[PDB]
Structures are given as structure tokens and as C-alpha cells.
């Protein structure tokens, strides 16, 4: 950890002279040569086990970020803040449709479902068991009000329009923001919003790829290129839709949540050992998926702490169509 | 507000008003920068989203004397130093060209241009490319007639100007290109602008814009305390001092193609540049102004002011080696 936590401050630091130009000009230019380069390339790129889950990310297994109101906000607490800020910023109302995009395990899903029983509330993922996990809980606690397709979302047409979409952690898989953006604005109805959650760093996108031959990060965490966008970065994609409004919260959110994360896994460990060797085979395997874990969750909370929190950071976009 | 009194009178120095302004600076960048990413977003974007319920816009120098302050195109708007030893002339030209070149003019292309002013941009795209039949737009009877005659002494059949007022022109024709340099700190609504212009965009035509801001917040021209003379004297009359990255929220009509910034010092240098031929000729100015004006008070009245005005303009612009104030330049595509 000690060390790990020190390995990373340094892959911050020259991640940080990287992306930073000594002049305005510079600066926003690189970024406007990032995002035209986006546009060559595909809308994206072309499984967890549910019992780990269940001890990592908390009661609705949200595999994003929550919002953390002062640091004894529980973990499951923040899972609520957080998407309750969603319902708000997407001007949510009882009785609409809701598409909901990358359900995941429909933490989000059964949230507005619950929340707003007027709500018709359909949900895609590319995962059987995400599906059926979720229409678990909908017999559980009678929620005739959800409904889950099952498709990829970078290939699903739809004749189906709906008044909010929703897109969280979506974004941080796909290459082309452009293709994306303009598929699902033909998913927006007559005077519908799109909600769009993205990790980012405040000043500069990038791709993930070594900084120097010595930097172990971008190949054991990322292992394919992804994009780290910036903030700001979607305000170049407006062609098809247009934006509303704009937010971004603060670092200490993710970096709390790993925070949260490392400590039930590490609280848990036993049991997490137990999981991972039934599903992976082996004790070494195991001993080494704890291991990936826990340098993801020690490493990231340490990069979204950076500066407390001005560096990278949690950016919201609300959009309404063409 | 005595202290205006004495200034006209000579009594204060041009280094007062630079380190009046320099106090200035330094209020208005403590009120606009927020200490999180979050709050500044918010500034920023209810200070954007404020814009849009407002009027589009609210509701005359001499000749001789552009002449002598300004380049013998008489760009009121700024120019390109690409080094501090460039003139006026060359930095308005070196500006020009840069703009011909980022908004892809190519010969034949119809050019609208808004806020013309005296026509150089309109001029000097004319003369450049005798395939573009350019229109200017300017509501000033003086600025109409002197292209008009500039259109007899160079033989350009290649040029027009409607004399009309932007915030209320209304066509349908449309043009290749369009610019609007310099014209949008005139205006605060810039949506029910950015709205009334798309519609003279034909198709795959291109708007061009460029327009002074600071590089972080937006703001409108209020005094910041009660020891705020620089706004009220010199604007009557809010006017909006827009955001670097403003106009990427004003995206319904118009799509971004790109966007770029250039450093405050070009207008900083400028700025500089106009004082000296201002101050080279300052009797001709008296004459021009005493004659002009009707008294040699309200002469001392306003040469004073643009002596301020070229002052503090080029002290703000280079706050932080010209990246607080700035340009932004970005050019859309018809949505
Ligand atoms: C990686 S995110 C995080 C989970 C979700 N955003 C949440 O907050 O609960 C999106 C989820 O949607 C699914 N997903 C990812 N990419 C997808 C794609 N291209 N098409 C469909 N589902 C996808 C994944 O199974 C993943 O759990
Ligand atoms: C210095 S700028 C543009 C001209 C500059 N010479 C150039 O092309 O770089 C300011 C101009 O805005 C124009 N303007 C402002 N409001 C206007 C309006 N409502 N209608 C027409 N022109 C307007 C004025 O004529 C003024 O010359």
C-alpha cells in the first residue's frame, strides 16, 4: 500500500507535466486537437462475480461514484446522495419514461423506479446476469415498473423514444464521442434531457498509454486504450444535441469512494479469498484479483485526492436534443 | 468622482491610471476566480444561462482622427504582433490574413461580414480575392460612404454595404462565410444573436468570430466596489465582458468547428501602439477635436478619455504575461 501509494503520486506528477502547457493558447489547442482525433475512431471499443460485489460497493452495487457529503456519510449513504443529484439535475418526473444506459446492476434503475412509480423505466447492459440480477430485485419488492433489454449499447436501434436518458460511467468506453452523442439523441423525445456522468481531469483529455518504460500503472490497471477525457471536453460535441447544463464535483467523491472500497474488501478479506478461488480455480489467481483490486482502489483514490480534488474529477452534462 | 475632474485636467499621471488600473485588475480577479473547479463552473454557467433572457443588444469618432490612432486600415479591433517590433499597420494585416486563413476563405465564396466599422476586414478580404463578392454591415452613415469612396480610390466592384443595424437586420440571403469580429461585446444575449445569425449561413457556410474576454470568467461591467471609477467612466450602459470558453454553451443554431485563443499581449501592444501615433499627434487631435466637438473642454474631455482608455486596456491585457485577458476566436458550422 505504502509504497503503492508512493508509485502513484509519481505517475500523477508526470501524468500532471504531461497534459499542462505554459500558455492558454497551447493548452486549449492541444485539447481541440484531442477531441477532432476522437472523431477517427470507433464509438467504443468491440465478469465480476455478484457475491464480491455485494461486500466492495454496498447495498445497490453501484459501480460508480457517490456523493459523499462529510466523511461519515456511509458508503451505502453516498450511493443515495449521489443519484438522488441525478434525479435532480435531470429534472426527473413521476410518469416519464426512462431509458437507462449501461444499467450495470440497476442501482440506478430501481432507484427511479422506487422513487417515481409512475415512472416506466427500461434498462440496457450487454450482461445475461446483470439482467436477471436486477429482475431478481424487481420480484423481490414488486416493481412492475422496470424493464431491462439486453443489448450492447453501441449497436442497439430503437424505434422506442424516451423522455430521459441516462448515461453514467458510460462514457470512460467509448472512443468516438461523436457517434455515441448522435446515436442517442435519436433515443430523446420532444423536449426529453440526456444525463451524462464522466470521470475526466479538469484541463486535458489523454489516451492510456506509458509514460515512460517505467511507469507499471497504465499496463496493470488498463490492459487496450482507453480515454481520460476532460471536463469541459463534451462541449465539442455538440452537433446533435446541445448542452443545458454543466457541473462538476469535486475529486474527494471517487476518492473517498475507493476509499470505501478498499476498506469492506479489506474487512471481508476471508471471505473475498473464498469467492475468488471458487470462481478463478486457484488460490494464486485469487491472491491475485484481491491484489488487482486493491492496488485500483489504493492507486485511484490516491489520484483522485490529488490537490484535494482540483485535478481530476467527477463532470456532469445535461443535454436536450438537436 | 473629482478624480475624473483633475484627470481631464492633466493632473494625473498616465502612471496613476496604469496603477489605478493595475488596482482594478487585481479586484476584478479576486471577485471572478473561485477557490474549486465547481464554484468557477457555476460562475461561469449561471452567468452563461443568465445571458439568455436579456435583450441581444441595448438600445461616432472622428475620421481624421482614426486616421491618425489608428493603421491605414483603421482596424478597430486588434492586430498580430508577432513581435513586439511589428507596427500597427503589419499587425492588423498579419491579423487579417489569420483570420482569412482560419475561416477558410477560398476566392469565389460570398462574405458577410457584421460590424464592418471603417471596412478593413471587409476591404481587405475584397481585395485579396476579386472572386468574393463581399457584403459589410454597419449602421454608421460616415462608415458606409468612406468604403464607398476607399471601393472608388482602389476600383472594387467588389463590395457592398447595408447600412442597417445587425441586432435588427433581417434577410434571407445567404453567404459562404461570415464574420463577426469584434462585434459580440456589443451584444449580451448571445443566443437570440447567435439564433438570428444561423439563419444567414448557407449550406456547409461557415461563421467566424472573435471577441475579447477574460480566459476563466465572465462578467458584466458593474463597479466592483465603491472605489470603482474605471467602469462607469469609461462604459455608460452594462455591458458584458465575456468568458474565454463562453460561447461553447451557445451551440443550439451553430455547431464548433474549433476554437482558439491568442495571448493579451497582441491587444496589449496595439492598445500601446495607439497611444504613441495618439500622443505623436496630440495638437492635431486638439485641432481635430476643438473643431469637431464645439469647445476645447469636451476636446480635453475626450481626448482625455482615450488616453485612459489606451492605458488601461493595455495594462489589463497583460495581467500575467497576457493570460488573464485575452482573445478567443471560434468558428461554428450552420447546425
Ligand atoms: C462500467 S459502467 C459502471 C456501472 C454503472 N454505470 C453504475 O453506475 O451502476 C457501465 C455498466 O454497463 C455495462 N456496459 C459497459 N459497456 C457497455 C456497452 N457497450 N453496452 C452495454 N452495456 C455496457 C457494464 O456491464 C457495466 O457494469
Ligand atoms: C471595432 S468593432 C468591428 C470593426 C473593426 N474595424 C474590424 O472589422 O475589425 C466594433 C464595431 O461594432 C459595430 N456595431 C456595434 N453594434 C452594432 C450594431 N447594432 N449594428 C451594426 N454595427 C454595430 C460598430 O460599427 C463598430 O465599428
Given at each position: 500500500?505504502?509504497?503503492?501509494?508512493?508509485?502513484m503520486?509519481?505517475?500523477?506528477?508526470?501524468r500532471?507535466?504531461?497534459?499542462?502547457?505554459?500558455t492558454?493558447?497551447?493548452?486549449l489547442?492541444?485539447?481541440?486537437?484531442?477531441?477532432?482525433?476522437?472523431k477517427?475512431?470507433?464509438?467504443?471499443?468491440?465478469?465480476?462475480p455478484?457475491?464480491?460485489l455485494?461486500?466492495m460497493?454496498?447495498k445497490?452495487?453501484?459501480?460508480?461514484?457517490?456523493?459523499?457529503?462529510?466523511?461519515?456519510?456511509?458508503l451505502?449513504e453516498?450511493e443515495?446522495?449521489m443519484?438522488?443529484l441525478y434525479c435532480?439535475?435531470?429534472?426527473?418526473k413521476?410518469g416519464?419514461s426512462?431509458?437507462?444506459?449501461?444499467?450495470?446492476?440497476g442501482?440506478?434503475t430501481?432507484h427511479?423506479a422506487?422513487?417515481?412509480?409512475?415512472?416506466?423505466?427500461?434498462?440496457?447492459?450487454n450482461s445475461?446476469?446483470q439482467?436477471?440480477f436486477?429482475?431478481d430485485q424487481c420480484?423481490?419488492?414488486?416493481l412492475?415498473?422496470?424493464?431491462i433489454?439486453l443489448e450492447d449499447?453501441?449497436?442497439f436501434?430503437?424505434?422506442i423514444?424516451?423522455?430521459?436518458?441516462f448515461?453514467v460511467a458510460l462514457i470512460?468506453?467509448?472512443?468516438?464521442?461523436?457517434?455515441?452523442l448522435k446515436?442517442?439523441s435519436?433515443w430523446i423525445?420532444?423536449?426529453?434531457?440526456?444525463?451524462?456522468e464522466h470521470?475526466?481531469?479538469?484541463?486535458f483529455?489523454y489516451?492510456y498509454?506509458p509514460l515512460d518504460?517505467?511507469?507499471w500503472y497504465?499496463?496493470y490497471?488498463?490492459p487496450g486504450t482507453?480515454?481520460?477525457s476532460?471536463?469541459?471536453?463534451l462541449?465539442?460535441?455538440?452537433?446533435?444535441?446541445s448542452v443545458?447544463?454543466?457541473?462538476?464535483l469535486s475529486g474527494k467523491?471517487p476518492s473517498?469512494?475507493?476509499?470505501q472500497w478498499?476498506?469492506?474488501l479489506d474487512?471481508?478479506?476471508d471471505?473475498?479469498?473464498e469467492?475468488f478461488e471458487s470462481?478463478?480455480?486457484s488460490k494464486?489467481?485469487?491472491?491475485?484479483?484481491?491484489?488487482?483490486?486493491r492496488?485500483f482502489?489504493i492507486?485511484?483514490?490516491?489520484?483522485?485526492?490529488?490537490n484535494?480534488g482540483?485535478?481530476?474529477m467527477?463532470?456532469q452534462?445535461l443535454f436536450?436534443k438537436?
Amino acid at each position: 500500500d505504502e509504497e503503492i501509494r508512493g508509485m502513484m503520486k509519481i505517475q500523477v506528477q508526470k501524468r500532471l507535466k504531461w497534459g499542462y502547457k505554459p500558455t492558454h493558447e497551447q493548452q486549449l489547442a492541444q485539447l481541440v486537437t484531442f477531441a477532432q482525433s476522437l472523431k477517427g475512431m470507433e464509438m467504443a471499443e468491440e465478469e465480476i462475480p455478484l457475491p464480491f460485489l455485494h461486500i466492495m460497493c454496498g447495498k445497490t452495487l453501484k459501480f460508480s461514484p457517490g456523493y459523499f457529503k462529510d466523511e461519515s456519510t456511509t458508503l451505502d449513504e453516498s450511493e443515495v446522495y449521489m443519484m438522488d443529484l441525478y434525479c435532480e439535475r435531470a429534472q426527473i418526473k413521476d410518469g416519464q419514461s426512462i431509458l437507462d444506459l449501461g444499467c450495470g446492476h440497476g442501482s440506478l434503475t430501481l432507484h427511479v423506479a422506487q422513487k417515481y412509480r409512475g415512472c416506466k423505466v427500461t434498462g440496457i447492459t450487454n450482461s445475461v446476469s446483470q439482467k436477471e440480477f436486477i429482475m431478481d430485485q424487481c420480484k423481490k419488492l414488486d416493481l412492475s415498473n422496470v424493464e431491462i433489454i439486453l443489448e450492447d449499447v453501441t449497436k442497439f436501434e430503437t424505434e422506442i423514444t424516451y423522455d430521459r436518458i441516462f448515461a453514467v460511467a458510460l462514457i470512460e468506453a467509448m472512443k468516438n464521442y461523436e457517434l455515441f452523442l448522435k446515436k442517442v439523441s435519436t433515443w430523446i423525445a420532444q423536449d426529453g434531457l440526456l444525463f451524462v456522468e464522466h470521470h475526466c481531469h479538469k484541463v486535458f483529455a489523454y489516451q492510456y498509454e506509458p509514460l515512460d518504460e517505467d511507469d507499471w500503472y497504465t499496463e496493470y490497471i488498463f490492459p487496450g486504450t482507453l480515454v481520460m477525457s476532460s471536463s469541459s471536453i463534451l462541449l465539442y460535441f455538440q452537433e446533435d444535441v446541445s448542452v443545458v447544463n454543466h457541473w462538476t464535483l469535486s475529486g474527494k467523491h471517487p476518492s473517498l469512494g475507493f476509499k470505501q472500497w478498499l476498506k469492506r474488501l479489506d474487512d471481508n478479506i476471508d471471505e473475498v479469498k473464498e469467492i475468488f478461488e471458487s470462481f478463478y480455480g486457484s488460490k494464486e489467481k485469487a491472491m491475485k484479483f484481491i491484489t488487482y483490486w486493491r492496488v485500483f482502489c489504493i492507486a485511484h483514490s490516491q489520484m483522485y485526492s490529488t490537490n484535494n480534488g482540483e485535478e481530476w474529477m467527477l463532470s456532469q452534462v445535461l443535454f436536450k436534443k438537436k
